[PDB]
Design a protein around this ligand. Sequence first.
Ligand SMILES: [Mg+2]
Ligand SMILES: [Mg+2]
Ligand SMILES: [Mg+2]
Ligand SMILES: [Mg+2]
Ligand SMILES: [Mg+2]
Ligand SMILES: [Mg+2]
Ligand SMILES: [Mg+2]
Ligand SMILES: [Mg+2]
Ligand SMILES: [Mg+2]
Ligand SMILES: [Mg+2]
Ligand SMILES: [Mg+2]
Ligand SMILES: [Mg+2]
Ligand SMILES: [Mg+2]
Ligand SMILES: [Mg+2]
Ligand SMILES: [Mg+2]
Ligand SMILES: [Mg+2]
Ligand SMILES: [Mg+2]
Ligand SMILES: [Mg+2]
Lengths: 430, 99, 18, 102, 63
Amino acid sequence: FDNLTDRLSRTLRNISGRGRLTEDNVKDTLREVRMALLEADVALPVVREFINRVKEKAVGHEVNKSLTPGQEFVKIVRNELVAAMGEENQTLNLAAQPPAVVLMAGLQGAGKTTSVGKLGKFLREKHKKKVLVVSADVYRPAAIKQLETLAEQVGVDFFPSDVGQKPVDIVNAALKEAKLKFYDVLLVDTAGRLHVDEAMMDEIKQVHASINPVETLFVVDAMTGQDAANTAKAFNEALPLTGVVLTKVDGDARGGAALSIRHITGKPIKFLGVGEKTEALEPFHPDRIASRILGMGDVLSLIEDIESKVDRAQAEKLASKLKKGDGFDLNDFLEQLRQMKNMGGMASLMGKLPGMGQIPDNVKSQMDDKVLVRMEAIINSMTMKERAKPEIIKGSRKRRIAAGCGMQVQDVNRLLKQFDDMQRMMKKMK
Amino acid sequence: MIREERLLKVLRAPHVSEKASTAMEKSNTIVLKVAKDATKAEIKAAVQKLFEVEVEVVNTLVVKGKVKRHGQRIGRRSDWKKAYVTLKEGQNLDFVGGA
Amino acid sequence: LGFPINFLTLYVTVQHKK
Amino acid sequence: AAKIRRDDEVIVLTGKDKGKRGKVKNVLSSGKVIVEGINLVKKHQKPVPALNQPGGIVEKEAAIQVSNVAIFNAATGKADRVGFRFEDGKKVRFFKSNSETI
Amino acid sequence: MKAKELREKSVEELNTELLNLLREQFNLRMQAASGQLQQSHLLKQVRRDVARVKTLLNEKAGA
RNA sequence: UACGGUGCUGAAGCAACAAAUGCCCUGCUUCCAGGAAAAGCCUCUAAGCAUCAGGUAACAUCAAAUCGUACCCCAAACCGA
RNA sequence: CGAAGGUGUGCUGUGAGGCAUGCUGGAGGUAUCAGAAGUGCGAAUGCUGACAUAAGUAACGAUAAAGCGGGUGAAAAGCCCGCUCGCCGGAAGACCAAGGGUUCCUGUCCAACGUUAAUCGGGGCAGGGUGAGUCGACCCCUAAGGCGAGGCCGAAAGGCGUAGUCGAUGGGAAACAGGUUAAUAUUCCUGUACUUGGUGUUACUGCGAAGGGGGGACGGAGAAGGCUAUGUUGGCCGGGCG
RNA sequence: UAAGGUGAUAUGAACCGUUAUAACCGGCGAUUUCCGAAUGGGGAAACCCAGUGUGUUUCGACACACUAUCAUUAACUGAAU
Ligand SMILES: [Mg+2]
Ligand SMILES: [Mg+2]
Ligand SMILES: [Mg+2]
Ligand SMILES: [Mg+2]
Ligand SMILES: [Mg+2]
Ligand SMILES: [Mg+2]
Ligand SMILES: [Mg+2]
Ligand SMILES: [Mg+2]
Ligand SMILES: [Mg+2]
Ligand SMILES: [Mg+2]
Ligand SMILES: [Mg+2]
Ligand SMILES: [Mg+2]
Ligand SMILES: [Mg+2]
Ligand SMILES: [Mg+2]
Ligand SMILES: [Mg+2]
Ligand SMILES: [Mg+2]
Ligand SMILES: [Mg+2]
Ligand SMILES: [Mg+2]
C-alpha cells in the first residue's frame, strides 16, 4: 500500500498524463490505489462498495468553488478511506475507573503474549499508575519466560505459575494480588487448545464469566487478514465491548484485509503497533492512519513539541528575572538534543512530511537524523562557557574536543558554522 | 479567418511573492504573470474559460529588469508583465491552494 | 511559529556536521 | 576517428602503463576517451548544504584520448579499420590481419 | 502524430496538444525548480511536436 | 509588541471676529501699442431619406482598449569628470 | 647527461665582441660559407608602460560645532535605540515637470567604491516593488514651423510650394473622502458619484454635410465690493493640580 | 555518415541514441514576429491609427489579407467648348 500513498503527490501534478483528458488521472489512481489494496491482502466484495460510493458522490457534487477539484477529490477519497476502515468512533482506551481487568483473549499465540508488553509498557509511561501482568496461558511453553523478560527489563513486575496448566485460579490468583497491593491496571493474555474458534471463545467463556473483566480484547496478526474477520466477528457477539488490535504490521505484508475485515463487522480496534520493539504499538483512529496520506502522520505531534521547547526557555526562569540581564547560556543548542533521545527526541517527526510549503531536497531529513548524534559527541566534550561564547573556537581549543570526543577534526569545523550561520540566517528578523 | 489568439497560452505560471496570497485575501484576486501582448480583455476569458474561475476585471502591469551576471561588460534588460484578475466571492474555484 | 522554529532547528542540526 | 563501440580491450602504447586492457572508452568526435588505463586522486571541497561529498576520488573521466591500440586475440597493436562488402555498410567494421569483431 | 505516422487524415483535431493535452506542462511551470520526485521529465517534447503536425498541413493543402 | 508597530474602542466636534497675491473675475473701469487658430459644442439648410432611417429625453444594460505610474527632482539619482 | 632567454665567473681579441663554464630555465638552437635586411639609440619639451622625487608633506569640499547611556559587532566619534544640544523653516519642508532609468523596499556582504573607520550607503549579490472608463500619453483640433500628389524651378544632387498631411508650449468629457502596503494609490478596499458611445424599452419629433451662421475666442493697466482658503478668541469635550 | 548525442561560457539536471532510420554534414522545401526602400495614413525606426474583405463566432467582436508613388499598355469614365 505504502507506495500508493505516493499516488498522493504522484497526483499533485498539473502536467497530467497523455490523455488530454487527464480525466483519467482519477480512475487510474482509483484502480491504481484500488490495486495496491487487494494485492495487499484486502478483501474485495466490499471494495466494489467503496469504489462505488466513491463514484456515487462525483455525479452528485462538486468542490465548493474557490478550490481546485483535484484536491476535494481527496477529502472524499480520504473521507471514505476512513469509513472504508475503522469509520468513526474514537476508541476509548483509557480508565473507566480503576483499577482494571484486561482480559486478553488470543487465538493461537502470535502477539499472543508480546503485545501485552508495549501495551502495559505503554500505560506505565502514562498515569502514576500501577500496571501488573500475568501469564494467562498454559498450553504453549515460554509463558512468563520470553515475556518474563521485559517485565523487569521495563520495571514492571508480573506473575505466573511454572508448568502449572490451569487458567482461572492462577488468573483469579494473580488479579487480586496487585489489587491487594492496590495497583492500577492489569493485563492478562490468555488462549486455549481447542481446535475450533468457537472453542477458543468457548474457553474465554468461563475465563470471562468467572472473573468479571471490564475491558476485553482479542488480537490477531494481519498474517491471517480479512480471513480473521469471522474469528473476531463471532465474539463481537460474545462481547460487543470486545475491542481489539492487529498483531504485527511490519509483521506480514497483507495488512489491509486484516484491519479491513475487522471494521466490516462493527469490529472495534484501538491500536496496531508495527511489530517488534517494546513501543512500536500505537493508538489508533483511521484518519490517524489514514494521516500521512494513507495512515501515520505525526508532526503535528513532533510539531507541537516546538511549543514544548519554544515557550519553555520561558523554562529556566520565565522570566526567572523579567528582562534583559543575560541570565542563561546558549548551549540549548545541544540542549535540544537531550530531550529528544532522552524521551522523545526520537526523530520528532522530522520526515519533511510534504515538503511543504517549500520542497527543497533528499539529505535534509533524508541525510542527518540517523546520525545527528555526532553533533552531540562534543558539547559534553566541552566546558559550559564554551557554548555561550560559540566564538572562541580556536583551532587549538577544540581539536581536543575533536579527539577528546573522538572525532577527527574536520567533522567539527565542519559544523561550527551550521551554528554560527543557523543564527545568521535564523536571526534574520527584518 | 480564425483569430490568431493564443486562446490558451496567453499567460504562464503565477507570479507568487509576498503580495501573492495576501492579495488573494482581498477578493480571491490572484496575480499570475501574462505575456506582453495580453490586453486584460484577453486575460478575463483566458482565466475564466478553460481554467474555470469566472473572474471579473483585471489590472496588469509591465516591469523591466537589468542586472550584470559575470564580471564586467555583460548586462541587459528583460521585461515582464503582471496581472491581478479578481474572482467574485460568489463564483469561486474550489481554490487550488494549500500550505 | 512551529514551522520556522522547527525548520531552523532542523536545518541547523543537518548543516553542522559535529 | 572513433575506435570503439560497446567495448574495446585496448592496450597502452604509452601513458604510465604497458598494456592494461580496459573498457568504457567512449572515444568520438567532440567528447572524450576514458578507460582504466589511467586514474588519479584528489577530492573536491564540499561545503555542507547536504554533504554533497559522497567521498572517494579516483578516476572520473581520466584523460588519454585516441591513439590507443585495441584488443587482439594475440599480442597487441593490430590497427583496425579495413572495410567489408555489405555487412551493414554503416561502417567499415573489419580488422587487420584476420578478424573483424571481438 | 509521430513522423510518417502523421500523414493520414486531414482533421486539425490531432493539433490540440494545447487543449487538455498541454495543461500538464502548465503545473510544473514554477521556476525555483520545485517538483524533484523521480522521473520529472519536464522537457519540451510536445512544443517541438506542435510543428510537424503544424506542418504537413500545407504538404497536403498547398505546398 | 518583533519595538518599527499592532487589534479594539472612542468624547466634543459650535459660534464670533479677522485675512489673500486664491475665487466671483475670459468680469467692471479705462488706455493705446488696439490684443492666435481649428475642432469639440449649438444651430441652419444641400444632395439623399421618403409608414424607414435618423433626432431629443428617461432609464436598462454592455463598452471605455493600449502605454506611463517605482524613486531622485533648487539635488549625493538631472547639467557641471 | 637541459635548447633559448635570465645572472655570475675565467680566458681571449685592437675593438665592435668570441669562447668556455657555475646557477635559473624548460624547450628548441644553429659551425662554415654564401645571401636578404624593418641591423645596433641616451638625448628629437621623442612615442608606450612601469617606478621614483617632492613626502608620509598639502589636503579630506562651506565655521549650522556637538555630549552622554545603551545595542550590535573582531572593532563604533560616524550605524540602530534613547535623552539632551544646535541648524533651516518663501525653506535646508512638501509636490511635479525636465532629465535620470531601479537610485525605491527587504535580506544580506564590506574586496573595490565612500577623500578616514564602517557593523552603514545612492556600493556588491539576491529577491520583492510601481494595479486607472475619470490623472497623463495615445486620441479629436489646430500655432510657429515641417513635410508635400500633381505642379513651378534647377547641370545631377536638389530648391519652392497647391490640395493635403504632421507639429503643443495652446482649445475638446468624466471622481471624491477615508482606509491600507516593507515599498503602490484621484489606480487596490469601503462609502458616495460622474462622462461618453453602442444596443434596448418608453415617450415626443423632421433627419441629413468635407458646407453657411453663432460660439469657442483670447491685450495691457487700474479700482473695488462679496467670498473662501486660514488664523485668532470664546464655548464645548477630554486631561491634568504642578 | 553514424556510436554516440541536446552550440559556447557550462556544468547540473531531465532526455535522445547504439550489428539497416539519435546527433552531425550536404541538396530541396516549410515557417520566417517587428523596424528598415517600407509601400494603407502617420510617425521623436522597432510604435499610433484607419478603409474594404474573410472565417469563426461561446455569433460580442476580434486575427489575418489587400489599399504607397511613378511609368507601358488596356478597360471604363469624362471639363472648360
Ligand atoms: Mg509616485
Ligand atoms: Mg568642473
Ligand atoms: Mg617636462
Ligand atoms: Mg598625519
Ligand atoms: Mg616640505
Ligand atoms: Mg606643515
Ligand atoms: Mg594640515
Ligand atoms: Mg565635510
Ligand atoms: Mg543597481
Ligand atoms: Mg535607501
Ligand atoms: Mg545598494
Ligand atoms: Mg495601467
Ligand atoms: Mg516644401
Ligand atoms: Mg492633425
Ligand atoms: Mg501640450
Ligand atoms: Mg512612496
Ligand atoms: Mg506602413
Ligand atoms: Mg511611410
